[PDB]
């Protein structure tokens, strides 16, 4: 969950039903509105499943961290590097194998390829796969 901040670099300190404040982190997110537009890293308010998951991990094993979103906003697989003769990765693991970011926290599946490249831990959250449609308004069709 990403939202823009004020000139102070912060944002509304929301709470929950029982009054517990929602954990906020400051994420330095590139301005990836359009390909070619100013795409530069600005402070933003970040919060969500991975955010409080990593804060829980930090509370457990006491690490320090930074958070930021990727530029292209894409998973990444073995694809041709600008119609060259080389099929390589891109996206999160594209820059992870390059050493840009240390650890990944995101709900990524585990196929065979990226598993061969890098090992994975236990699956923190189980999941399945479903088609989604915007149902249909119940209407009986007939003339008169």
């Amino acid at each position: 969950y990403v939202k823009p901040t004020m000139s102070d670099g912060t944002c509304k300190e929301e709470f929950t039903v029982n009054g517990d404040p929602v954990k906020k982190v400051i994420c330095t997110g590139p301005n990836d509105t359009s390909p070619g537009s100013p795409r530069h890293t600005v402070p933003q308010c970040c919060y969500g499943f991975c955010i409080d998951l990593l804060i829980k991990l930090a509370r457990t094993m006491n690490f320090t961290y930074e958070v930021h979103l990727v530029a292209d906003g894409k998973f990444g697989t073995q694809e041709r590097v600008n119609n060259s003769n080389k099929k390589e990765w891109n996206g999160m693991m594209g820059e992870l194998l390059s050493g840009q970011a240390d650890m990944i926290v995101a709900p990524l599946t585990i196929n065979n390829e990226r598993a061969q490249y890098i090992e994975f831990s236990k699956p923190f959250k189980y999941q399945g796969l479903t088609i989604l449609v915007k149902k249909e308004i119940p209407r009986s069709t007939l003339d008169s």
Binding site: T16, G48, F49, D52, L53, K56, L57, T60, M61, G73, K74, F75, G76, T77, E79, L96, L97, D102, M103, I104, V105, P107, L108, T109, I110, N111, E113, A115, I118, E119, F120, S121, K122, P123, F124, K125, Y126, Q127, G128, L129, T130, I131, L132, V133, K134, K135, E136, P138, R139, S140, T141, L142, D143, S144
Partner: protein, 192 residues
């Protein structure tokens, strides 16, 4: 006859899922695709028995899930294949989205990077520790199962007045007769 007419008029169509006849072929009418260049892409690259639908995908693919659900909101891209949790979350939020049939590819999401890191064992340690204290249920009640409009009551469609609006103007015809027969009343004395 009218009873049989209206009761036998069932709505369409409840997508079964993998075993959908519409899924077995590129549906030019029904628009459905997935997020271009994603995990499902290589999933389908393993089973190229779907290869036909695969080259139906790029012709209507999307570069993000957010614009994919935005398309699902309006006419184009009526259906989108995706993980169960996000899609049921959006379904609970908007109260006008439905899941399929039976779910498939019963996978898991965890965490992993380069092999130079025994941190993943501590990650497994943390996930089991939260299994021993119920912390993923906290995440669920915060984000996933935050109540949020549990939709129900799938009625087999109703009947409304405008559908029968036609019969109504029939009485208007009789209203017209209110200005005709009442002169025929005088004509009843005129003829003799």
């Amino acid at each position: 006859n009218l009873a049989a007419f209206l009761v036998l008029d069932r709505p369409e169509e409840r997508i079964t899922g993998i075993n959908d006849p519409r899924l077995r072929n590129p549906s030019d009418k029904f628009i459905y695709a997935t997020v271009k260049q994603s995990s499902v892409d290589i999933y389908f690259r393993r089973q190229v028995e779907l290869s036909t639908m695969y080259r139906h995908m790029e012709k209507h693919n999307y570069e993000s899930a957010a614009e994919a659900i935005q398309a699902v909101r309006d006419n184009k891209l009526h259906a989108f294949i995706w993980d169960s949790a996000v899609l049921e979350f959006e379904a609970s939020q908007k109260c006008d989205l439905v899941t399929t049939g039976e779910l498939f590819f019963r996978s898991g999401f965890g965490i992993g990077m380069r092999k130079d890191s025994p941190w993943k064992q501590n990650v497994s340690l943390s996930i089991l520790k939260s299994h021993e204290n119920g912390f993923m249920e906290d995440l669920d009640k915060t984000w996933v199962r935050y109540q949020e409009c549990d939709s129900r009551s799938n009625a087999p469609a109703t009947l409304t007045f405008e559908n029968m609006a036609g019969v109504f103007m029939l009485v208007a015809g009789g209203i017209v007769a209110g200005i005709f027969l009442i002169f025929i009343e005088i004509a009843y004395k005129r003829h003799k």
